[PDB]
Chain length 187, copies 2
C-alpha cells in the first residue's frame, strides 16, 4: 500500500505501464498517462503546455479544475454561451482578427475546452460541429470525459462513440476513474 516517490524518481512499477497501455488501447489513442487525482490533472496540464500569449475559448459551464488550471498558466480567457455555436464561430473569427490585447499581434495559439457531458444540465457537447470549426480555423480541441467515459455509448467509450467521430480529431482527451469505475485517479 506504499508508494516510493514521484514517477520520475522511483515510483514506477510494471502495473503503471500495464494500466497506461490498457487505457490507451481502450480509448482508441496511441499513448496515455495515469495520475492519482483528477483535480490535479486538470490543474497542472495547461501550466505545462500553455503560456501568456495564447488564448483559451472555454464553455461557460466548465468545471472548477479547468478554470484553476487555466488561471495558473497565464493565458487569456474568453467564454461562449452554453449550447451556442454561431456565437462560437463569431468569437473565433473576431479573436483571430483582433489579436493579442493592447499589442494586436497574432495569437500564438488557440485552444477550445469543453466537456463530454455537463453534470448539472445533463446535456452533451456538439462534437461534430466542434470538429468542423477546429479543422476549418486551425484551432485545437480539449475534451473532459469525466461523466461520459464508461457509462455512455453503444459499448462505453464516451461521446466519440455516440457521435461516430474518429478519436483522432480530438487533440487531448482526459477523464477520471472516480465516477463510473469505483476507483480514483485520472488519465
Amino acid at each position: 500500500i506504499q508508494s516510493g516517490g514521484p514517477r520520475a524518481q522511483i515510483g514506477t512499477t510494471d502495473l503503471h505501464i500495464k494500466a497506461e497501455k490498457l487505457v490507451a488501447r481502450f480509448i482508441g489513442k496511441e499513448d496515455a498517462l495515469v495520475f492519482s487525482m483528477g483535480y490535479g490533472t486538470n490543474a497542472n496540464l495547461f501550466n505545462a503546455f500553455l503560456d501568456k500569449k495564447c488564448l483559451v475559448i472555454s464553455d461557460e459551464l466548465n468545471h472548477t479544475s479547468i478554470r484553476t488550471g487555466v488561471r495558473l498558466s497565464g493565458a487569456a480567457v474568453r467564454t461562449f454561451k452554453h449550447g451556442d455555436m454561431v456565437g462560437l464561430e463569431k468569437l473565433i473569427r473576431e479573436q483571430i482578427v483582433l489579436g493579442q490585447p493592447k499589442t494586436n499581434r497574432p495569437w500564438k495559439k488557440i485552444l477550445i475546452c469543453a466537456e463530454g457531458l455537463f453534470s448539472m444540465e445533463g446535456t452533451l457537447c456538439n462534437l461534430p460541429k466542434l470538429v468542423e470549426l477546429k479543422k476549418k480555423y486551425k484551432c485545437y480541441l480539449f475534451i473532459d470525459e469525466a461523466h461520459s467515459i464508461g457509462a455512455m455509448g453503444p459499448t462505453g467509450r464516451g461521446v466519440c462513440e455516440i457521435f461516430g467521430v474518429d478519436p483522432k480529431d480530438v487533440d487531448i482527451l482526459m477523464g477520471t476513474f472516480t465516477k463510473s469505475f469505483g476507483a480514483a485517479g485520472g488519465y
Copy 2:
C-alpha cells in the same frame, strides 16, 4: 557610339567593369553599378527590392524620381516635415506600434529616404542623427547624393566626408554624373 543591347544580353564591355570598380573605390563602398539615366535608376530601384507590406518614411522635399519609384512598387508612404528630427523619431515609434493599416500586423520592413543636399533650399541632411535612429530602431537608410558628390567635402566625396560618417552605415548610396562631372548616367 553604338551599344549592343541590355547589359545582360550583349551590352557589357570592359569599360563598364572599369567604371564600376573605379566608382566603388572612389565612394568607399565595395561594389557598384552604372546606368544610362538617373531618373530611370530612381524609378526602377524600389520596384526591385520593395513590396506592398513595407513602409517608406521619406522627406517632404524629395525629388520626383524617388516618388515615382516608390509609387511603382506599392509600399506605404509617410512623410515628415523638412529639417525636423523629433517628428521623425515620433513617426518611427508610432508606425512601429501601429503596424500595417487595417490589419495591424508588424511592418515587414522600414526604409528612410533623404537627400544629401536639397537643390531648392540649399540645406543639408542631418546624417549623424539619421544614423543614430537607424541603428537604434533597426531601420534602413537610402541617400541620394545627386548634388553633393564631386562638389562638396574636403576632397569631394559628399556628405559622408562632411560629417565624418563612415560610409558603411548607409545601406544604399546613389547619385548622378550629370551635375558635377559633365556627363550622363547614374550609379
